[PDB]
Design a protein around this nucleic acid. Structure first.
Lengths: 122, 72, 50, 54, 92
RNA sequence: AAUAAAAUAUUACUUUGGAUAGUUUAGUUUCCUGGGCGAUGAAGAACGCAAUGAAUUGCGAUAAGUGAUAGGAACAAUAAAAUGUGAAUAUCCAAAAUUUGAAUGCUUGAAAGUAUACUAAGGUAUAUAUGAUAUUCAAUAUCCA
RNA sequence: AAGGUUCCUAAACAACAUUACUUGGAUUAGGGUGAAUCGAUCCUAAAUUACAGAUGGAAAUCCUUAAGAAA
RNA sequence: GAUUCACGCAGUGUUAACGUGCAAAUUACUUGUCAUAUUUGAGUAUAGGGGCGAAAGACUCAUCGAACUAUCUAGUAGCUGG
RNA sequence: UGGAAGUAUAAAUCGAAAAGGUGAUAGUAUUCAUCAAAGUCUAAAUAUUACAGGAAAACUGAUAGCAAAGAAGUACUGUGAA
RNA sequence: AGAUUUGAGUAUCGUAAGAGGACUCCCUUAACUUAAGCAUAUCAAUAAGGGAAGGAAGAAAAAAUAACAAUGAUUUCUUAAGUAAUGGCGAAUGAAAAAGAAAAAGACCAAGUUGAUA
């Protein structure tokens, strides 16, 4: 595994693309070498290269998704992929405000007749 | 000739592999699966078949997503 | 049969692929009990029923 | 276990087969089929009056 | 003696065992303590009347009832609206 | 009348067998805490992925693993390469997540496929029932110029 | 149709083919299936199954163009 | 819906062979039959107090005077064995 | 249903009110007692052998204990349920 | 033409489906068995079949008990109690008030009223 996150992060978007074609092309020639009787050093190189492509693709996708969240942060209609992580039940539940809602009659009585603090002498 | 001789013509499959359960229980002429109860939306399960429940149910497979959620 | 569906043919191919023994190196692992594949079959011994 | 040793669909073969009348596992294809069943003295069957947690 | 035993039905599914009894004490006592720490007036088990038991077999004994009538609050000069807030049970 | 080849009996040793003894990373029961899945595609099924893998385990075209955060020097059956500029290992996190399956464009037998629209190839949306809003209509159904 | 790698070759004979086997449809490792014109795919037969509708306590059943602002 | 032979097919007889068989119904010869009420492949339809039957209670996966499979169910037994 | 001249539900028919229901022996009357049906919500005390994570045990110790102490609902059988 | 009523197509934002069902709320007229036979009864809200739920659910604020020196929503435990009663009054089935505890909590629509009405 020799590509380094530091090297990938510094690269620009086009460099990430151009590096991806090179890595995919480099990987393709290494598959040919293994089939045609390659050397063990070449075969171990094949395993290493496969990790850069996974490493390279992660950074491109993660940066693209992070940029999208910044776009839709203020958006009224957020895509479902960028919505907060919940379960199906959690989405259907009433909001905490809705649960604690009270009518004006019951809210005003609780204001004028709260639960007092007291104790009994013994 | 109800024994050895009659078994000569057995070369026509009745059941083929099902698509929802993967077993060779899809009846060709009946157009239904005898095991997982195909096109019927609900999986076919019976309380008399207690063993058939423990052979294919929740937790007998990969649990690819449910294992993350419950651990969450 | 000579004629088969595409999906059925692939399921045939996997059954061919799974009819193999343990590689020698796996047999030399420390604390190894898997010496023979007991799920093996041959065409004239057991019909795979598919 | 409440169902320990009772998890078979066995029925006795009856008489006329030169074997005892203890119930026998059904089916074929394995060594278990045709063997003994729930009976107290049989192998892999329930024991005498099973111990109850109450 | 003539025996009258009702075990013809499947009593084995009707058997209830009390193995959780020693842990009900710990649950209830701990919860009873937790309420006291939250608002100690709440667990005071608000005051209750002194009412007779029913029937002539018990009518000479007194036992706690539920809630004071609206006439007993008036006699004692307590508002029924404020009574519930200071640990008094009220039963209209 | 005689023989001890066979036969029989006892012990020692060896053999076929796996009892007995010692042992437990497995079960059984009770109790405590929770009881946290799915159209944002679940449970289940299928196929594929390791340098040498058939099963099993883990994973999904980024494949027995990627990033991040902790973590501090290993793995090994045999080689290789990487490695204190960070190896193993851990995760309620991030990206990614093949064909199906309630399966939901249409079809689906073991079926290969295929229609339109939006953004050649790729990717999205289009099943049924249903609530709200918007828009286009139908019926002299009630009035009505 | 059914079987599913049994096909071809090489090495090898512990087991298997009621003796034996240098043989094998048996062991191990490789190789092997090329379509615009042959078939599937297209059409309909006996028959089969949907949305809506009708029936049913329910599961589900009926209807296949009749009942539909559908097809 | 005449008489026969043949490819085939059936199962009249030997009550032959075999009867721990080649075979959980087969073999040999003899016999009959061998195209229109014929033989036969695939598809399709009919399901358990049901189907199907030129009718034998016959057939419905070696299971039929009520199939197979699982639950009630460790069904009950004044009877047999220990 | 323990509810016995009808405890509860449903169906056919019938069908109220200047209110009325109940006091379990049917009926009418007069008192007495006690509630006010035919709409809705509501924590706490309670259950649990699905499943997940833990802790215990006068439990079993490889024919025992779950069917499963190893790639166990696996090998293997059946057209299939199983 | 215009004012309404009703019914559709399409678009947008959502919603139900499936898994699990140990515990929870229900639908349905099983039989083996017991009665030393058996036909009501028993087995028995039991088995199978079907629907619906949550971390608990169901119930819940008197058209309730009682006849007292009276109580007072619901739920669960003790007792009442194998009791009253039911039953070829046979086999068998079978509660509840009182009383002792755990916990405690009460609020709404409809109808009525206010209408330079919102």
């Amino acid at each position: 595994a020799s590509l380094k996150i530091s090297a990938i992060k510094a690269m620009s978007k086009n460099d990430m693309n151009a590096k991806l074609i090179e890595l995919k092309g480099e990987l393709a020639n290494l598959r040919t070498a293994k089939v045609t009787g390659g050397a063990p050093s070449k075969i171990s190189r094949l395993r290493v290269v496969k990790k850069d492509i996974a490493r390279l693709l992660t950074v491109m996708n993660t940066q693209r998704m992070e940029a999208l969240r910044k776009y839709y942060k203020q958006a009224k209609y957020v895509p479902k992929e960028l919505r907060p992580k919940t379960t199906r039940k959690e989405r259907r539940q009433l909001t905490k405000a809705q649960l604690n809602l009270k009518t004006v009659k019951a809210a005003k009585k609780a204001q004028h007749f709260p639960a007092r603090k007291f104790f009994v002498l013994a | 000739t109800k024994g050895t001789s009659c078994r000569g013509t057995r070369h026509n499959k009745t059941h083929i592999l099902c698509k929802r359960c993967g077993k060779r229980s899809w009846h060709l002429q009946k157009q239904r699966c005898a095991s997982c109860g195909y096109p019927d939306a609900k999986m076919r399960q019976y309380a008399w078949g207690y063993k058939a429940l423990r052979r294919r149910t929740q937790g007998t497979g990969r649990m690819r997503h449910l294992k993350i959620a419950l651990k969450r | 049969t000579g004629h088969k569906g595409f999906s059925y043919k692939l399921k045939l191919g996997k059954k061919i692929h799974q009819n193999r023994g343990v590689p020698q190196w796996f047999r030399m692992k420390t604390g190894n009990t898997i010496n023979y594949n007991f799920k093996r079959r041959h065409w004239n011994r057991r019909k795979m029923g598919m | 276990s409440t169902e320990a040793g009772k998890q078979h669909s066995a029925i006795s073969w009856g008489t006329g087969r030169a074997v005892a009348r203890i119930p026998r596992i059904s089916g074929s294809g394995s060594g278990r089929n045709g063997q003994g069943a729930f009976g107290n003295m049989t192998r892999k069957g329930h024991m005498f009056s099973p111990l109850k947690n109450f | 003696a003539v025996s009258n035993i009702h075990f013809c039905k499947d009593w084995r599914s009707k058997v209830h065992t009390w193995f959780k009894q020693p842990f009900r004490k710990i649950r209830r006592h701990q919860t009873r303590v937790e309420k006291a720490k939250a608002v100690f007036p709440a667990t005071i088990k608000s005051l209750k009347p002194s009412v007779h038991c029913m029937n002539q077999r018990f009518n000479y004994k007194l036992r706690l009832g539920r809630g004071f009538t609206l006439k007993e609050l008036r006699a004692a000069k307590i508002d029924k609206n404020l009574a519930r807030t200071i640990g008094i049970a009220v039963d209209p």
